Design a protein around this ligand. Structure first.
Ligand code: MG
Ligand code: MG
Ligand code: MG
Ligand code: MG
Ligand code: MG
Ligand code: MG
Ligand code: MG
Ligand code: MG
Ligand code: MG
Ligand code: MG
Ligand code: MG
Ligand code: MG
Ligand code: MG
Ligand code: MG
Ligand code: MG
Ligand code: MG
Ligand code: MG
Ligand code: MG
Ligand code: MG
Ligand code: MG
Ligand code: MG
Ligand code: MG
Ligand code: MG
Ligand code: MG
Ligand code: MG
Ligand code: MG
Ligand code: MG
Ligand code: MG
Ligand code: MG
Ligand code: MG
Ligand code: MG
Ligand code: MG
Ligand code: MG
Ligand code: MG
Ligand code: MG
Ligand code: MG
Ligand code: MG
Ligand code: ZN
Ligand code: ZN
Lengths: 201, 91, 214, 97, 97, 25, 127
RNA sequence: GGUGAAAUUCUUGGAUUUAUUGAAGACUAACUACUGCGAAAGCAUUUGCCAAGGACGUUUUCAUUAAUCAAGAACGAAAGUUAGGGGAUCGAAGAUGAUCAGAUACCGUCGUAGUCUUAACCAUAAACUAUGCCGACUAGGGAUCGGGUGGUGUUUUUUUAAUGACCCACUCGGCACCUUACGAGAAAUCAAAGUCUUUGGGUUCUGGGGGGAGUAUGGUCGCAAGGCUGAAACUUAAAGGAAUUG
């Protein structure tokens, strides 16, 4: 139920004679037997984990923390990555652009891992038939298949009811709506086929 | 002994799903089934098994890759951009 | 009911060293109030003045120079190298029809570690007694000429910073050594360094900066 | 029939050049077919020269004119600049004047 | 080139191909030079380099995968180490290598 | 009418007989 | 001798700008354009309005602290006409004849290593 | 701001102007010419790498291996299609401001697709020199690009040279122009469009009054838009070319 492969990465224990194993999200091109370096003063190759400080802008980084030491949070899905676009040395920040395109500024002590996440393009292939969707969610959660509220009775949904299948009122619903009201396009600030190019400015 | 004018591996799907949808799948199945050249021993013995997990017949190396091809385009460009930027740390 | 002039702190612009008049210009700021003082805010501006306007002699009518302000002290702020341009009228003259153009450039580091990229333009000349009306190089000529220029330019830098690099450009030593190695290949005329820009200053180092001051 | 051995304008052994835009109406037009005027003229003008050097620092200064290449599109070259239109004979004459 | 030299060595000298045989050469002191594939693993590399320095044999690291070293010696299989046993007309021993 | 526009004329006209004839395939 | 500044005259068609600034540029000193001293839109670029605007410029110029100035004339440039506007000379004429000083002037029109498709369409602006 | 003139538009959100920086995509100004290269399409920043080519030089080598070509095939501007990316600029569509009797336009503003690139398609342009290829012959001239030969030629200084650029003469192969016209044409014109009723070097292709019509039909190719192949009934005395005078 994860799109991207994981990668078991074994380490020594600094304080006791033992191995300690971790579970990383495998960045693309990472291979068994490879050595992974993790730290402030580590070098800049795919697979190592380095604080957002220690990488020049344009570095491409995955599984990056929001807060330093929360052990990874951003860009973890098969194919995603964050780009560093700038640093503030005084008040040690860094500014990044997340997979959604939002620009966010975090501590430079927050760590990421050099590269992108393996399994890119997983979504390019048509699912092609019900059953593959069926098995997809079989390993995720019980969210499939989905019935249109407009096929229900009014008891079941705001869209339910009528002698023809229709929403009956606007399907844009307020942010200040209430549980039981919010089905449709919640808080939508526009609507209709996105004409023209998107992309954040 | 040419068997199909054009459906290739996609011929398993019969008349179903509509041509354009089968096309797209054919591209990515041809991708995801082929044997690939191994970086570590040069034998063409890398094959896939589960999206993004490419490993080697002999030599037994497993390389995390793209979902249906070993090297995704974008990671490849990323490679050289880590190339590039790292150069600015020794030199 | 303000008139920022009836409030404007004022100032005068001092020059570096290896030239002529260390007194250059005049400016306007704003009184050094607590929170937003006249000092740290601007200063670090940039003023461009023809070097003949600062060298006196008109055998330098072109060759604009860009200076950048670094430090301030009691109504007296200095300035250091930040660039060298050419006038538009000069090139727009220079580049005459019926001949060949040749451009070349290279990126290089100096002693006191400024990284800069200089340029170099040069045109073929009719040789006295020519009857044909144009006189062009031979491409294979232009490849040799660029390579030589490139060799010479990479040599003349990484010497004692701009200071000495500037001390080389001012008398156009470069233009003449170019001319020397060139004439083996092909005539040429004008031949200048034209442009040179900064793109990686080192660090402040106030002690080294004060070396053009007295 | 044909009314110009040079066709529109001058190109033999090429088949394709590269269009330039017309400084007047912005019309694309091949470079060899253009019509081009070197516009070198003073920054100042006729009358400003005396009061210039008058209210001017420097001994007479130096005076640096402005050079810029112009491009017209036949139609705009006909509507104003170099044209007239000439007799069938007066056409072949490439003498500048 | 470096391959142009190898092509001469191939048609006038004696050589063995492959890991095990060039160790019979390195121990026998018969090897005059060993060429090492780009992708041949570091362990085998480091070993060959230790066997070499124990026989005073120089080592030229071929900047190519064991596949192209196979066309370098003109064999339709792959090779990750060559051992020069006799250099024929070529000069590889007494040039840059 | 301009030859090019008269080309587009029948270019369309054909494409509509194309439609109409397929009604009886 | 004099205190020096930088003049900078943008004389396009349909308008003419004159505004001296500090020789570094980062600090202004009084603008006033050829549009301000007339109201007819059609008359936003004629030499008379440019004169009156050069007047209103030189006035505060000699009324703040700048006694002398270097000028930088400049057409629209870019992919535009690259030729000076009518009221560019009229303003230079009206600031030397005003009584300020003139020191070494050049043309700073942005000329490209050509591109970005000029406007108007391949068939030009046809009227 | 924008125009012939204006309006739509932008401006406490200090617009327009300015200075300092940074980002992105496109492009290659001037130099650029009756100048180069390529089968054509087409091709102007630097450098490195990869393979290729003509001309020239040639007392090398082979020895008829060739010329032109139904079928067949490689490449083929621009737009257009499929899938990614890219999407600064300009901008089919569309919406607007004006203009107009009207104005679905011309002009102004916004601006979707496109414009850029990768993997595929598509195969058409006034894809033009509106001019098949190979060979021979027939007439004067000054330029110019590449190669070569000749010189007690010029300029470069040093110690004379060597070089390099330049000058003059020549000869190959180019891109062109000039004047001629023995000759050709219906003429405009043409060193071929010449050596043709004094009608034959070799060979490929196409046309047979105008419309109907590149339409109908079949075959074939394409995802599509469309490409190639491609009639007839009927209609009609002109359609057409070049030149002259008005
Ligand atoms: Mg994942
Ligand atoms: Mg779910
Ligand atoms: Mg369920
Ligand atoms: Mg449903
Ligand atoms: Mg649904
Ligand atoms: Mg129901
Ligand atoms: Mg209800
Ligand atoms: Mg409701
Ligand atoms: Mg309902
Ligand atoms: Mg419905
Ligand atoms: Mg069978
Ligand atoms: Mg040479
Ligand atoms: Mg043309
Ligand atoms: Mg063409
Ligand atoms: Mg039906
Ligand atoms: Mg008109
Ligand atoms: Mg250029
Ligand atoms: Mg057949
Ligand atoms: Mg195309
Ligand atoms: Mg766009
Ligand atoms: Mg419209
Ligand atoms: Mg309207
Ligand atoms: Mg319309
Ligand atoms: Mg419009
Ligand atoms: Mg055709
Ligand atoms: Mg033509
Ligand atoms: Mg034709
Ligand atoms: Mg002749
Ligand atoms: Mg000679
Ligand atoms: Mg004749
Ligand atoms: Mg005659
Ligand atoms: Mg007929
Ligand atoms: Mg059919
Ligand atoms: Mg398709
Ligand atoms: Mg068809
Ligand atoms: Mg046909
Ligand atoms: Mg048909
Ligand atoms: Zn392997
Ligand atoms: Zn025009």
């Amino acid at each position: 139920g994860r799109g991207a492969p994981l990668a078991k990465v074994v380490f020594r224990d600094p304080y006791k004679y033992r191995l300690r194993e971790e579970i990383f999200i495998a960045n693309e091109g990472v291979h068994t037997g490879q050595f992974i370096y993790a730290g402030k003063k580590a070098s800049l190759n795919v697979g190592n984990v380095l604080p957002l400080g220690s990488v020049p802008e344009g570095t491409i980084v995955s599984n990056v923390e929001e807060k330093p030491g929360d052990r990874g949070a951003l860009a973890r899905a098969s194919g995603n990555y964050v780009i560093i676009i700038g640093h503030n040395p005084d008040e040690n920040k860094t500014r990044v652009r997340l997979p959604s395109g939002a620009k966010k500024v975090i501590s430079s002590d927050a760590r990421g891992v050099i590269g992108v996440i393996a399994g890119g393009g997983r979504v390019d292939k048509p699912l092609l038939k019900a059953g593959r969707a069926f098995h997809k969610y079989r390993l995720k959660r019980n969210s499939w298949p989905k019935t249109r509220g407009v096929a229900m009775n009014p008891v079941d949904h705001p869209h339910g009811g009528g002698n023809h299948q229709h929403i009956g009122k606007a399907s844009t619903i307020s942010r200040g709506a209430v549980s039981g009201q919010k089905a449709g396009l919640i808080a939508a600030r526009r609507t209709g086929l996105l004409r023209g190019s998107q992309k954040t400015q | 002994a040419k068997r199909t004018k054009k459906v290739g591996i996609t011929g398993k799907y019969g008349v179903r799903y509509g041509s354009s949808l089968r096309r797209q799948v054919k591209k990515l199945e041809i991708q995801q089934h082929a044997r690939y050249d191994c970086s570590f021993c040069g034998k063409k013995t890398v094959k896939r098994g589960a999206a993004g997990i490419w490993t080697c017949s002999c030599c037994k190396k497993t390389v995390a890759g793209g979902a249906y091809t070993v090297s995704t385009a974008a990671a490849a460009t990323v490679r050289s951009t880590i190339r590039r930027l790292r150069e600015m740390v020794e030199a | 009911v303000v008139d920022p002039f009836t409030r404007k702190e004022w100032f005068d612009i001092k020059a570096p060293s290896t030239f002529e008049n260390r007194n250059v210009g005049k400016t306007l700021v704003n009184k050094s109030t607590g929170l937003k003082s006249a000092s740290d805010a601007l200063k670090g501006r940039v003023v461009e003045v023809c070097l003949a306007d600062l060298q006196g002699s008109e055998d330098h009518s072109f060759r604009k120079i860009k200076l950048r302000v670094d430090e301030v002290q009691g109504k007296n702020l200095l300035t250091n190298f930040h660039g060298m341009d050419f006038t538009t009228d000069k090139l727009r003259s220079m580049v005459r029809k019926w001949q060949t153009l040749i451009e070349a450039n290279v990126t290089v580091k100096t002693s006191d570690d400024y990284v800069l990229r200089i340029f170099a333009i040069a045109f073929t000349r009719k040789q006295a007694n020519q009857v044909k009306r144009h006189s062009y190089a031979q491409s294979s000529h232009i490849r040799a000429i660029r390579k030589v220029i490139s060799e010479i330019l990479t040599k003349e830098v990484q010497g004692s910073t701009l200071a000495q690099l500037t001390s080389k450009l001012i008398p156009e030593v470069i233009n003449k050594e170019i001319e020397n190695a060139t004439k083996d290949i092909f005539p040429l005329q004008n031949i200048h360094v034209r442009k040179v820009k900064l793109l990686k200053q080192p660090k402040f180092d106030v002690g080294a900066l004060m070396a053009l001051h007295g | 029939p044909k009314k110009r051995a040079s066709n529109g304008r001058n190109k033999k052994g090429r088949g394709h050049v590269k269009p330039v835009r017309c400084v007047n109406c912005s019309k694309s037009i091949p470079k060899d077919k253009a019509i081009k005027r070197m516009a070198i003229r003073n920054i100042v003008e006729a009358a400003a020269v005396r009061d210039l050097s008058e209210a001017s620092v420097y001994p007479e200064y130096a005076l640096p004119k402005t050079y810029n290449k112009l491009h017209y599109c036949v139609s705009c070259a006909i509507h104003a600049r170099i044209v007239r239109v000439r007799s069938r004979e007066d056409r072949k004459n490439r003498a500048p004047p | 080139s470096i391959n142009q030299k190898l092509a001469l060595v191939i048609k006038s000298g004696k050589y063995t191909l492959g890991y095990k045989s060039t160790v019979k050469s390195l121990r026998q002191g018969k090897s005059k030079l060993i060429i090492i594939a780009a992708n041949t693993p570091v362990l085998r590399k480091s070993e060959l380099e230790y066997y070499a320095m124990l026989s005073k044999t120089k080592v030229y690291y071929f900047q190519g995968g064991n596949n192209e070293l196979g066309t370098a010696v003109g064999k339709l299989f792959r090779v990750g180490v060559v051992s020069i046993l006799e250099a024929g007309d070529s000069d590889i021993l007494t040039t840059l290598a | 009418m301009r030859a090019k526009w008269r080309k587009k004329r029948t270019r369309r006209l054909k494409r509509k007989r194309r439609k109409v004839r397929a009604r009886s395939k | 001798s004099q205190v020096f500044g930088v003049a900078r005259i943008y004389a396009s068609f349909n308008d003419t700008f004159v505004h001296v600034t500090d020789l570094s540029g980062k600090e202004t000193i009084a603008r006033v354009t050829g549009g301000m001293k007339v109201k007819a839109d059609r008359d936003e670029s004629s030499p008379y309005a440019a004169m009156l605007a050069a007047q209103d410029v030189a006035a505060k110029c000699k009324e703040v602290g700048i006694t002398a100035v270097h000028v930088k004339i400049r057409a629209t440039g870019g992919t535009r006409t690259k030729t000076p506007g009518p009221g560019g000379q009229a303003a230079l004429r009206a600031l030397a004849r005003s009584g300020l000083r003139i020191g070494r002037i050049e043309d700073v029109t942005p000329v490209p290593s050509d591109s970005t498709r000029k406007k108007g369409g391949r068939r030009g602006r046809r009227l």
